[PDB]
């Protein structure tokens, strides 16, 4: 996701005398011209925030030109894409020759290769914006390329889930590291609040594993959305409230944290079970509170961003008309 | 062109965009040193004899700022 | 369980030198000579002449038709826009202790 | 992208194992056919790679 | 062995020039002097 990173490089200056007249402006211009819009150090550079440090404009010894060089350390905004990230807008340039691939249409350029093995991948047609989830493989940020390279498949909500066991109680003073992320999710939810609720409902029931047309809406001041199924009549807890409980310093972090497929993914709610009440598709992972909480927060942020991007990019009913066949793929795959 | 990260010769081409290091892959940091084709041939000969040559590029220096 | 050894690549064990910090000795604590050595004066004139060949803007009021003459007269008239950095030490902690000298305020040797 | 000016400060000598050869090499010789036409034979010892 | 690059032979075998004589001392541009006396080409 969008993040702040610090790089350090060396810039060659062809005309040091003219360069030194306005060093800050010229350095910023050179950094923007060279690094913005390219993959560097496993990260895609979006813009240059500033120059943290720099060095005097030295003069090249080895060559006989008067050119100089400057060591510059700069802080920039970069986009890093993990595994399982959801990309709402992906245009398929060429679905042919038993290979598929599409380019992202968001703030983070990506070239995703979609295999022809899956039937859903074959069904998609060119010139069609089809939502996509990146595969478990890491994203390949080849240096110098203007877009990342990855492999993905059309997002089909999968029924298998995982259960996480917390053996260590809540980490103390790491709640601030978690709070850094609760801020990001809060910003995402504020952004989601602006757009219409009907489109959000449409996409949520499209991508809800257990499709519910009941129109029953769970209402949470930060988040509002159609309600799902109830498992064992258990009560989920809002992640934001539990994090806010950091002031109390007691949060019952040990309990098994899990989010069942019914529980809306964008919703901050998650179920806490003293025992393995949730069915374990895989043995509950033995992980610390840090690992779990970061994981759940990342998943919810990914889903919230997916939903906002879906609502924004499909803002036209006719585009939805074209992509209703993709919607039919998702609906046919959906079970309950 | 030598990769700062690993200190091994790297691949850099400006006209045809190529910014590649065989060893580091991503995390490559190419720097242009001035040298002589004779020295390049000398280093290539030494590598052929199974003597790995790692070039430690001079560290970057920043003002205290 | 006996364990065999497969030698990793050298690059993996290589760590690049950490970035240094430039420590400029205060003006009053400098101990290197205030008179430019012949090498330093020659280097200053050569660099200024090359940069003049690149960019023709010069502070000198008088007009010359060669970059070398312009650079020489800039050095003699104390208008040269370059500085001399004398690297004194490179500490293991990651510091480059240097002395910055201004040519315009320095003595100039006999270049002719 | 651009390659900034740099200088060599030290040189480290070491014994190069087969892992170094595999990682650094850009191809593998498989055939003994030196030339195919005017252009070098692909996979030979004169491969343009 | 780790060989630092000093003297004449070591830089020469690496293709670089020895750092002595006219290259012993670094030359850096006087930003303060230029910013008060010279004008940018664009400006
Ligand atoms: Zn490398």
Curated annotation (Swiss-Prot), chain A:
Principal subcellular localisation of the protein: host cell
Source organism superkingdom: Viruses
GO process terms (BP): viral transcription
Keyword set, alphabetical order: DNA-directed RNA polymerase, Early protein, Host cytoplasm, Transcription, Viral transcription, Virion
Keyword Transcription: yes
Compartments, as annotated in UniProt: Host cytoplasm; Virion
GO cellular component, one term: virion component
Induction: Expressed in the early phase of the viral replicative cycle.
Functional summary from the UniProt entry: Component of the DNA-directed RNA polymerase (RNAP) that catalyzes the transcription in the cytoplasm of viral DNA into RNA using the four ribonucleoside triphosphates as substrates.
Oligomer status and interactors: Part of the viral DNA-directed RNA polymerase that consists of 8 polII-like subunits (RPB1, RPB2, RPB3, RPB5, RPB6, RPB7, RPB9, RPB10), a capping enzyme and a termination factor.
Annotated family: Belongs to the Asfivirus DNA-directed RNA polymerase RPB7 homolog family.
Domain notes: Contains an extended C-terminus, with no homology to characterized proteins.
Protein's name according to its UniProt entry: DNA-directed RNA polymerase RPB7 homolog
Protein species of origin: African swine fever virus (strain Badajoz 1971 Vero-adapted) (Ba71V)
From Swiss-Prot, chain B:
Positions of C4-type zinc fingers: 3-24
UniProt-annotated location(s): Host cytoplasm; Virion
Position of the signal peptide: none
Coiled-coil annotated residue ranges, if any: none
Expression triggers: Expressed in the late phase of the viral replicative cycle.
Additional remarks: The binding of ribonucleoside triphosphate to the RNA polymerase transcribing complex probably involves a two-step mechanism. The initial binding seems to occur at the entry (E) site and involves a magnesium ion coordinated by three conserved aspartate residues of the two largest RNA Pol subunits.
Subunit structure: Part of the viral DNA-directed RNA polymerase that consists of 8 polII-like subunits (RPB1, RPB2, RPB3, RPB5, RPB6, RPB7, RPB9, RPB10), a capping enzyme and a termination factor.
The protein's role, per its UniProt record: Catalytic component of the DNA-directed RNA polymerase (RNAP) that catalyzes the transcription in the cytoplasm of viral DNA into RNA using the four ribonucleoside triphosphates as substrates. Forms the polymerase active center together with RPB1. Part of the core element with the central large cleft, the clamp element that moves to open and close the cleft and the jaws that are thought to grab the incoming DNA template.
Membership in a protein family: Belongs to the RNA polymerase beta chain family.
Protein name (Swiss-Prot/TrEMBL): DNA-directed RNA polymerase RPB2 homolog
Organism: African swine fever virus (strain Badajoz 1971 Vero-adapted) (Ba71V)
Residue numbers of the full-length protein present here: 1178 to 1242 of 1242
From Swiss-Prot, chain C:
Function description: Component of the DNA-directed RNA polymerase (RNAP) that catalyzes the transcription in the cytoplasm of viral DNA into RNA using the four ribonucleoside triphosphates as substrates.
Keyword Transcription: yes
Coiled coil (residue ranges): none
Primary localization class, coarse: host cell
GO molecular function, one term: DNA binding
Swiss-Prot/TrEMBL GO biological process terms: transcription by RNA polymerase I; transcription by RNA polymerase II; tRNA transcription by RNA polymerase III; viral transcription
Keyword Methyltransferase found: no
Protein name: DNA-directed RNA polymerase RPB6 homolog
Family designation: Belongs to the archaeal RpoK/eukaryotic RPB6 RNA polymerase subunit family.
Known partners and oligomeric status: Part of the viral DNA-directed RNA polymerase that consists of 8 polII-like subunits (RPB1, RPB2, RPB3, RPB5, RPB6, RPB7, RPB9, RPB10), a capping enzyme and a termination factor.
Superkingdom per UniProt: Viruses
Localization per Swiss-Prot or TrEMBL: Host cytoplasm; Virion
Keywords per UniProt: DNA-directed RNA polymerase, Host cytoplasm, Transcription, Viral transcription, Virion
Species assigned in the record: African swine fever virus (strain Badajoz 1971 Vero-adapted) (Ba71V)
One GO CC annotation: DNA-directed RNA polymerase complex
Swiss-Prot record, chain E:
SS bonds (residue pairs): none
Similarity comment text for this entry: Belongs to the RNA polymerase beta' chain family.
Coiled coil ranges: none
Organism from which the protein derives: African swine fever virus (strain Badajoz 1971 Vero-adapted) (Ba71V)
Phylogenetic placement of the source organism: Viruses, Varidnaviria, Bamfordvirae, Nucleocytoviricota, Pokkesviricetes
Domain free text: Lacks the typical C-terminal domain (CTD).
Triggers of expression: Expressed in the late phase of the viral replicative cycle.
Subunit structure: Part of the viral DNA-directed RNA polymerase that consists of 8 polII-like subunits (RPB1, RPB2, RPB3, RPB5, RPB6, RPB7, RPB9, RPB10), a capping enzyme and a termination factor.
Transmembrane segments: none
Role noted for this protein: Catalytic component of the DNA-directed RNA polymerase (RNAP) that catalyzes the transcription in the cytoplasm of viral DNA into RNA using the four ribonucleoside triphosphates as substrates. Forms the polymerase active center together with RPB2. Part of the core element with the central large cleft, the clamp element that moves to open and close the cleft and the jaws that are thought to grab the incoming DNA template.
Subcellular location as annotated: Virion
Protein name from the UniProt record: DNA-directed RNA polymerase RPB1 homolog
């Amino acid at each position: 996701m969008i993040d702040q990173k610090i790089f350090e490089t060396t810039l060659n200056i062809d005309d040091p005398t003219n360069f030194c007249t306005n060093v800050e402006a010229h350095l910023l211009k050179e950094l923007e011209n060279i690094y913005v819009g390219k993959c560097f150090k496993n990260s895609f550079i979006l813009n240059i925030t500033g120059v943290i440090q720099r060095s005097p404009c030295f003069i090249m010894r080895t060559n006989n030109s008067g050119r100089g060089y400057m060591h510059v350390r700069f802080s920039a905004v970069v986009s890093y894409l993990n595994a399982f990230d959801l990309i709402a807008a992906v245009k398929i340039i060429k679905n042919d020759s038993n290979i598929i691939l599409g380019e992202s249409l968001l703030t983070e350029p990506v070239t995703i290769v979609i295999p022809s093995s899956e039937s859903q991948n074959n069904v998609a047609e060119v010139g069609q914006i089809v939502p996509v989830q990146l595969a478990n493989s890491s994203v390949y940020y080849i240096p110098g390329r203007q877009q990342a390279s990855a492999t993905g498949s059309i997002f089909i909500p999968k029924h298998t889930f995982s259960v996480y066991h917390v053996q260590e109680e809540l980490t103390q003073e790491q709640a601030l590291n978690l709070t850094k992320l609760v801020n990001i999710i809060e910003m995402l939810l504020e952004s989601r609040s602006k757009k219409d609720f009907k489109q959000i409902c449409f996409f949520e029931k499209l991508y809800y594993t257990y499709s519910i047309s009941s129109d029953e809406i769970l209402d949470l001041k930060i988040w509002k959305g159609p309600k799902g199924k109830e498992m064992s009549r258990l009560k989920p807890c809002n992640v934001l409230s539990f994090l806010y409980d950091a002031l109390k310093n007691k949060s019952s972090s040990l309990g098994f944290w899990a989010r069942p497929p019914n529980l809306l993914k964008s919703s901050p709610l998650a179920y806490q079970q003293d025992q393995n009440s949730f069915n374990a598709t895989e043995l509950p992972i033995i992980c610390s509170a840090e690992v779990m909480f970061v994981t759940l927060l990342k998943e919810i942020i990914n889903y919230l961003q997916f939903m906002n991007d879906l609502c924004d990019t499909f803002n036209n009913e006719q585009l939805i008309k074209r992509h209703e066949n993709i919607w039919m793929l998702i609906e046919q795959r959906k079970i309950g | 062109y030598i990769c700062r990260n690993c200190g091994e010769p790297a691949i850099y081409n400006a006209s045809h965009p190529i910014y590649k290091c065989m060893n580091c892959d991503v995390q490559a940091d190419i720097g242009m040193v001035d040298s002589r084709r004779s020295s390049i041939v000398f280093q290539h000969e030494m590598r052929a004899a199974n003597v790995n040559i790692t070039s430690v590029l001079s560290p970057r220096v920043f003002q205290p700022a | 369980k006996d364990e065999i050894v497969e030698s990793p690549s050298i690059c993996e064990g290589f760590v690049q030198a950490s970035s240094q910090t430039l420590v400029i000795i205060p003006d009053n604590e400098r101990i290197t000579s205030n008179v430019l050595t012949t090498f330093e004066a020659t280097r200053l004139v050569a660099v200024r002449a090359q940069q003049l060949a690149i960019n023709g803007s010069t502070m000198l009021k008088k007009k010359y038709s060669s970059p070398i003459d312009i650079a020489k007269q800039e050095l003699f008239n104390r208008k040269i826009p370059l500085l001399v950095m004398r690297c004194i030490k490179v500490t293991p902690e990651g510091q480059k202790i240097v002395e910055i000298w201004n040519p315009r305020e320095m003595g100039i040797p006999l270049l002719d | 992208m651009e390659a900034g000016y740099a200088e060599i400060a030290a040189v480290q000598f070491n014994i190069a194992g087969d892992n170094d050869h595999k990682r650094q090499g850009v191809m593998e010789v498989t055939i003994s056919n030196l030339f195919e036409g005017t252009l070098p034979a692909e996979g030979g010892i004169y491969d343009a790679r | 062995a780790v060989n630092p690059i000093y003297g004449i032979a070591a830089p020469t075998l690496m293709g670089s020039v020895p750092r002595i004589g006219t290259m012993y001392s670094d030359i850096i541009m006087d930003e303060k002097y230029i910013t008060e006396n010279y004008k940018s080409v664009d400006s």
